[model samples]
Target: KSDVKLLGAWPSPFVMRPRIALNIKSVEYEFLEETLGSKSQLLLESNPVHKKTPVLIHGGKPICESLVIVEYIDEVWSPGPAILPSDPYDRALARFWAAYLDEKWFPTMRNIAAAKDEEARKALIDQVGEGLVLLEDAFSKCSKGKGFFGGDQIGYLDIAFGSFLGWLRAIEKMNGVKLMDETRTPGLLKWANSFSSHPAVKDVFPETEKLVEFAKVLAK
Candidate 1:
């Protein structure tokens, strides 16, 4: 029997990260969905600290944090397509971009949905625009002008940033704004298309409309 279980809700980007990682590696596992605001006994024991979704239970052990779980999958399933770069320098660079995305860029976009007024929302969009420009340059360097941040294959940086596409698209629809605008961040826009359409991610990725619906429910 499979001992690998992923504890998470379907719509969470954090939850989606490990699912993509597992998919890329062709790992067979069970997805244990955690209902919103209701933590199961397994979830509490698996991630006692945060008691959050996305705790990867492998071989009866728990691994928390989306990025860490993805890295773990890459390491454990070494035979699959390389997730993080093999080279130390390249891997470090990839980690840097991933960190920047999670810590700064994505958060700015998330703030737009919660922004108090149209003016504040516009300011957040501007901030997200600036962040996308920086990421566009990072993508050029990281991908080495190839198709993805991982270059020729979906890897760590790709999953890290790509997982948030649902929320990004939802924000765009809700605000009537264009954060991942083609003119401003053409590289990222193209990359987004590639990443979302990749066989590994296509099915696992949430639909934008679904996320928009979920966000509305959460807001209420």
Candidate 2:
């Protein structure tokens, strides 16, 4: 048995974040698939507060939250392929955008799904547009022709936003919404493509068609 074990579900984009991180780092681990309705004893014991999947168990100690787990992995396995930037300023900048994505994009997604009327849905779509605008600005400033957050390599910011892209595409298809248009947010779209096509990320994603089908069922 490997020293690392991950509790996750196949359809969860959050779970895929750390999965990609571990894969990129070439860390050996075990994957324990969990069912949402019936909680696993391991998961319950691991994340007693959230009781959620995508929990990382390293040396029998569980770490909850995907982003938190990513930070943990980076710290534990530093100097190998650094996920966070070495320069404090650069790291802070990267973290700023990552947190912006979490605060802006995620809640807008929930609003889009839960909106009761067409007007409310359109309003939420506009909110999503505003968030994408901020993302485009951040990408233009940060990319520096390297095609990723930190030049020539995928890092913590890339992983955080990349997982959001995968989930957004799936959710958009399910809801028949077009929030990320190439014309309006070209840089953001390019970043999405770049991150998704990265060798580390490509290997960790679920089959696209399968994920879309699953999203369709889950959305209703």
State the lDDT of candidate 1 residue by residue for 1-220, as single tens digits.
Answer: 2699999987889999999999999999999999866779998888889988799889999999999999999999999999999899999999998899899988888888778998998998999878888989899999988899999899899999999888888988988878777787889999999999999999888889998888888975
Off by over 4 Å in 1: none
Q: Give the clashing pairs for model 2.
A: none
Which ranges of candidate 2 are over 4 A from the true structure? none
- Each candidate's clash count: 0, 0
Q: Model 1 Cα displacement at 208 (Å)?
A: 1.1
Ten residues in sequence with the least summed lDDT for candidate 1: 175-184
lDDT of model number 1: 0.90
